[PDB]
Design a protein around this ligand. Structure first.
Ligand code: HEM
Length: 394
């Protein structure tokens, strides 16, 4: 809905809304592939959401994703002058070199070692939820299962009392009640906990960050609060939506479902193919300087969207990427991004998927979409299958 600027050839104009639903009834990733296939250039421009460029080829997307010297994490959301400014929060908004010490802190604290006890936490939660609805023979998977996981897991990582789950779920939902008021509510909740752990440190992630340094100086309360929020939100819709694609797929692909049920040792490799097959995140970058790129002039202040989606779905760099194959000898993808801002929660994401797949298949080996209804999907910063119902015998 914005005026076409003088740095945008009309040859690169296309009708793209990252918030608009997938047309009923294409497959989410198929839809994207058609957008990629119809586009006259690898880099197109859309009047929607402030007006912004979109990288529509794999190599291009990964370049914008990773080349911080030209494309900055200063704004990552569209529209830039509403959502982009609204959600800009250090250190995720930082570029290298400044982003370096924070990246280290994020990556080490969400690593395999300090997340070791989380595995039994995910196991007990998954089991309790599944045993809950198993005798009903049906469930809304997104509301009754997927959505019940990430806040509870976050809360065990940072060691917060389970009584606070509804409060925290409500804040995270309303964050993603004016926004600035939600952030204040986040800090009013988190600051006493951080201050309590400065006095009596434990082994949780807040205590670990507190006893860490970045510039050779301690973290401030502001920085630790920012990181807590970003870690809570960062693993919420991502994990819920990923689980949605995974289980709606299993529901349809009976060949795959029956193999995994009859042989759970397939889960480790199936997992790797679920992360390749179903990229969900579309992040963007801000242009800081006038730059010649892709045969056009990128003005300073321009936004460039670089979806993880266009990476693994590019058939000029991937073999039949819509096909779900356990056989795959090559599985390159950027579902977790590329560059300094590569997802530090990727280990947690894979641990969660594994436990969920293992406990689900132990208990409900055979299931499908109720009445084998068609899937419908949404786009956004995190893509999704709209809420679906699963059914199983007894
Ligand atoms: C299937 C699950 C997940 C997917 C697909 C995913 C995807 C991504 C992507 C694409 C990025 C890069 C954003 C960019 O280009 O700037 C990212 C970063 C990030 N993720 Fe994840 N994520 C997942 C799970 C998680 C979890 C479980 C956590 C936390 C426990 C988490 C926390 C974060 C944080 C804090 C960042 C920001 C890194 C930085 O900018 O320094 N994510 N994620």
């Amino acid at each position: 809905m914005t005026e076409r600027p003088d740095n945008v050839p009309a040859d690169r104009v296309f009708d793209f809304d990252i918030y608009r639903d997938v047309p009923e009834g294409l497959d989410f990733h198929q839809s994207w592939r058609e957008i990629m296939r119809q586009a006259p250039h690898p880099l197109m421009w859309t009047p929607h959401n402030g007006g912004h460029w979109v990288a529509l080829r794999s190599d291009l997307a990964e370049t914008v994703m990773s080349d911080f010297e030209r494309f900055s994490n200063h704004t990552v959301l569209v529209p830039k002058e509403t959502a982009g400014e609204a959600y800009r929060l250090i250190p995720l908004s930082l570029d290298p070199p400044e982003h370096r010490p924070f990246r280290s802190l994020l990556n080490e604290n969400l690593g395999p070692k300090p997340l070791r006890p989380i595995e039994q936490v995910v196991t007990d939660l998954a089991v309790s939820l599944i045993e809950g609805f198993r005798p009903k023979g049906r469930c809304n998977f997104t509301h009754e299962f997927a959505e019940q996981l990430p806040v509870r897991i976050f809360m065990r990582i940072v060691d917060l009392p389970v009584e606070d789950l509804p409060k925290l779920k409500h804040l995270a939902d309303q964050y993603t009640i004016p926004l600035d008021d939600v952030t204040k509510q986040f800090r009013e909740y988190l600051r006493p906990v951080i201050e309590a752990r400065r006095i009596k440190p434990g082994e949780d992630m807040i205590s670990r960050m507190i006893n860490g340094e970045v510039g050779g100086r301690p973290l401030t309360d502001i920085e630790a609060e920012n990181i807590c929020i970003q870690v809570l939100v960062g693993g919420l819709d991502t994990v819920v939506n990923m689980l949605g694609f995974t289980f709606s797929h299993l529901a349809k692909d009976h060949a795959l479902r029956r193999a995994i049920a009859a042989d759970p040792s397939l889960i480790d490799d199936a997992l790797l193919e679920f992360f390749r097959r179903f990229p969900v995140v579309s992040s963007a970058r801000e242009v800081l300087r006038d730059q010649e790129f892709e045969g056009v002039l990128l003005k300073a202040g321009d936004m460039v969207m670089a979806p993880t989606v266009v990476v693994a779905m590019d058939d000029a760099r991937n073999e039949d990427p819509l096909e779900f194959r356990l056989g795959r000898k090559a599985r390159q993808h950027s579902t977790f991004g590329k560059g300094s801002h590569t997802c530090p929660g990727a280990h947690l994401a894979r641990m969660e998927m594994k436990v969920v797949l293992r406990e689900w298949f132990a208990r409900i080996p055979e299931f499908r979409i109720e009445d084998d209804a068609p899937l419908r999907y949404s786009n956004g910063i995190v893509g999704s299958v709209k809420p679906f119902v699963l059914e199983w015998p007894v």
